[PDB]
Paper text:
SARM1 regulates axonal degeneration through its NAD-metabolizing activity and is a drug target for neurodegenerative disorders. It is self-inhibitory and is activated by nicotinamide mononucleotide (NMN), resulting in depletion of the intracellular NAD-pool. However, recent studies suggest that nicotinamide adenine dinucleotide (NAD) itself is an inhibitor of SARM1 activation and the balance between NMN and NAD controls the activation of SARM1. We have documented that SARM1 is a multifunctional enzyme with properties similar to CD38, a universal signaling enzyme possessing not only NADase activity but also catalyzing both the cyclization of NAD to cyclic ADP-ribose (cADPR) and the exchange of nicotinamide in NADP with nicotinic acid to produce nicotinic acid adenine dinucleotide phosphate (NAADP).
Library screening identified a derivative of nisoldipine (NSDP) as a covalent inhibitor of SARM1 that reacted with the cysteines, especially Cys311 in its ARM domain and blocked its NMN-activation, protecting axons from degeneration. Also, dHNN-inhibition was time-dependent, but not Nam, strongly suggesting dHNN covalently reacted with SARM1. Indeed, LC-MS/MS identified several dHNN-modified peptides, among which Cys311 in the ARM domain is the dominant one. For the dHNN-treated SARM1, larger octamer ring corresponding to both the SAM and ARM/TIR domains could be clearly observed. Its 3D-structure was constructed at 2.4 Å resolution with residues from 56 to 549 (ARM and SAM domains) and 561 to 702 (TIR domain) all fitted into the cryo-EM map. Extra electron density was only observed near residue Cys311, the dHNN-target, but not other cysteine residues, consistent with it being derived from dHNN (5F, purple). dHNN interacts with Glu264, Leu268, Arg307, Phe308, and Ala315 (green) in the ARM domain, pushing the insertion loop (red) toward ARM1 and stabilizes the domain. This is similar to that observed with NAD, which binds at the other side of the insertion loop and stabilizes the ARM domain possibly via ligating ARM1 and the insertion loop. The IC50 of dHNN in the SARM1-dN-expression cells is around 4 μM, close to the IC50 in vitro. dHNN decreased the cellular cADPR in cells expressing SARM1, but not in those expressing SAM-TIR. These results suggest that dHNN is cell-permeant and acts mainly by blocking SARM1 activation but not its enzymatic activities. The Cryo-EM structure showed that SARM1 was locked into an inactive conformation by the inhibitor, uncovering a potential neuroprotective mechanism of dihydropyridines. Chemical blockers may well be an ideal tool for turning off the NAD depletion. dHNN uncovered in this study is the first compound ever described that can block the activation of SARM1, revealing a druggable allosteric site and can thus usher in a new approach for therapeutic drug development.
Author numbering:
A (entry chain C): 56 to 201
B (entry chain B): 56 to 549
C (entry chain A): 376 to 549, 561 to 705
Write the structure that this text describes.
Amino acid sequence: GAGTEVQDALERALPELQQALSALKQAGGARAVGAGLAEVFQLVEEAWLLPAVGREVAQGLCDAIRLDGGLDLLLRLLQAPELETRVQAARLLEQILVAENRDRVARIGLGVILNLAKEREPVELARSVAGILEHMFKHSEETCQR
Amino acid sequence: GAGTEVQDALERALPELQQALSALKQAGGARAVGAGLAEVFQLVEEAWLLPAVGREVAQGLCDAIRLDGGLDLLLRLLQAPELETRVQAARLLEQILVAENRDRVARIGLGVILNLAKEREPVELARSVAGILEHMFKHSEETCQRLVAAGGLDAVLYWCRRTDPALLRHCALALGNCALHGGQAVQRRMVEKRAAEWLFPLAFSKEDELLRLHACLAVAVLATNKEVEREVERSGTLALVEPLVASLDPGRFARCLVDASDTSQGRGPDDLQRLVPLLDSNRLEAQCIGAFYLCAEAAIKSLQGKTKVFSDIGAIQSLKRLVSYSTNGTKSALAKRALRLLGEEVPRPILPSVPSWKEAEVQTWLQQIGFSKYCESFREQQVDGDLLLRLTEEELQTDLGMKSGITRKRFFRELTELKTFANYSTCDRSNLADWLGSLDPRFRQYTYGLVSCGLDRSLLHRVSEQQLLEDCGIHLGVHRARILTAAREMLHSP
Amino acid sequence: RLVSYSTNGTKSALAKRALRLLGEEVPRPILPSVPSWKEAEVQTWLQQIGFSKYCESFREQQVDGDLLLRLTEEELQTDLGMKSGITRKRFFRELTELKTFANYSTCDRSNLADWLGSLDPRFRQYTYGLVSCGLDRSLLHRVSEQQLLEDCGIHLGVHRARILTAAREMLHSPTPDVFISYRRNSGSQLASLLKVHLQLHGFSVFIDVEKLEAGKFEDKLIQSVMGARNFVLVLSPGALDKCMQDHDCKDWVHKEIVTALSCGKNIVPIIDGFEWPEPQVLPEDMQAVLTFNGIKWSHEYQEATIEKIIRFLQGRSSR
């Protein structure tokens, strides 16, 4: 049913996240951001989970998260003064870099990741930013040079 | 109704101006001249105003103003003792210079404009005479020679100081057109007068982007020339090209440049061939700016049916060659976007490790450079990367099937272009590539010829000239002589 | 032929008018940058000189400007199809007529064209032959006669002899200084303009060029401000409001003050459109700047203002 579900899996995942991704977007609550973050993280851990369906449901979903104007939200929240919102935003950013989103991140974001590379102590930060650098070394030769 | 109104628009505009242009022609009234001036200025601001009709109604009207004997009236009133009649006459003269009237102005008027170039103080004077010089730099090379040799450039470089948001656009376009259609001598005398330094306050203003675009275009055209690129790089204004191009969108400046100058469908063919020679050069800023302008023009000209001028000029082959050897993110993006706007398919970038290639990669290479009809012979003889890097003329002539000498010379030209780009990390030992490229950028193309024979930086001090003629494959005697004289010195001296 | 190589307005006009009086069509002038030509322009050239029946062979072999400037007799005889020696000699005559007219601004480096044309007007036709091989005015003093026979393509022995004897004679016989701090919002214009006005008098100067929204702290800008001899400050209207009682790094103009003042160098303020405030709107480390005095900028006698601001630096004892 994989050749059938290419409309069906995307017609049951975008329905809810399509609002929830911006449901809490302007709220400057300390503990408010974490809930939506966890929600989206659960969904991207759901797309990959079910076998033989997870490739297209993951890639089209990630492309929709790119097209919805949410990367700039992540790039903002990476510079927030609180630390647990930073680590949750990083662990969510780890799971989105596929071959198309990585171009946009290499276009705009590249400086904030280097700014995060100075913070060494919190382990959940390092565990995700190491994977971010892992995925970002595969893009181009100029990116590796930088 | 544009194909109908070519009689109808001219049968409702000439009716009134045809008398009003000379209605007040002999009157020496101080305040009398201004009324007719304003009247005509209103009409020429009416012709351009209404869209999709303004091109022919403007050009034929201007031709009729030329044929009516009114240019001499303007050239008289430019020398009048009163000042407000001078500024109104100048602002009217700005709006008439089209490709035919400009010849007559360059014939007769050229001295009075230079006489006006001394008056710097009244701003409405400078705002129009800057546009007059802008339009007059596009005529010929002799006209540019005169305007640089009679002090008409000093005016522009002094007016670069002021802070008017409409004077500086004319100033930037003046310097750009002068460097573009000027020639060699005018460029040297431009860079001698520190024009590269004065472009920096014009490109650093963060108020508008059209000023930055025209300033970067002017500095790129000046930096394409090889003789004075050292001065321009010492000026330090080339470093401000990359951020600007990287932080814009061609799609939004498309739907711009369609209303500002004359509401036209872009720049002409002979204007478009002024960008392609700066698209093929060993500079990065120049290539980026060229890519930007071509992308924008392609956007504007692909809505229409004219999709053949970019093949007549030869921008398709240059853009594909720009994509294939892309060592940057910005110009590669712009190039791919500009090729996507046309029907030409996008090429893929090629791996820089030229040795250890296989037959497939060689085929794709021959598919991107243009030698697509010889792919069969290569797939037949099973040529690879190694066998490609060591080809000679005999194998081309005999079994690969390149009979004509001009095809062989094209092939070698493309090949030597490719061999300065490759990565010799798996063959070289003592980094001989770098030691060659230090002498001359063109000297890297022989490095594999040296490495596959077995030389390195410890074994070059005792090689002969004959030993480089057939073993390593260096044909030009000058190149052999320089390699020998630069290596024989180096025993352990550097 | 007079129209095609027209370097004047009068004779070109008269020529076009005289051709218009006859049934012959008017040719178009050709661009003087002969390298970086394409196939179309080559075709029009062959349409104007008279070799109009060989256009097919050129469009077939895809000859361009570069491949035209380096043609030899063999390619004419073999595949381009000029069998007779008299046609080849006409073609070379027209070509050498064209090559003394071209513009080598994008290939030449040391202006070798001029040094050739000084010997003889007919000697410019070989300049591309020299440039594409790689020679220049520093590398001609050690070339041979054989090395000009096949590499550069000079056939007449007299010409080689004169080039060698005229070149072999000629061996040689014929950290920034100051810094400029300025508000990113306003005062961009007078900062750029002060930069160019200082640089034109022989002083080096380094200005901030779009560092923000990136790595901002210790990002190779703090040694610059301590290794620069003289310090400059741009007082735009409403330029000191953001640093009023914040004493943090978000005030991008603060750090430079706190470091240039630690070093103890000359800080010249530029007074324009604004005067100093009360001394309570700035912290304890910023009470000194409120007391300094500087130059009053004007948009009328800028040259005098520069002539006066030179002395206010350490120009007496710089460098």
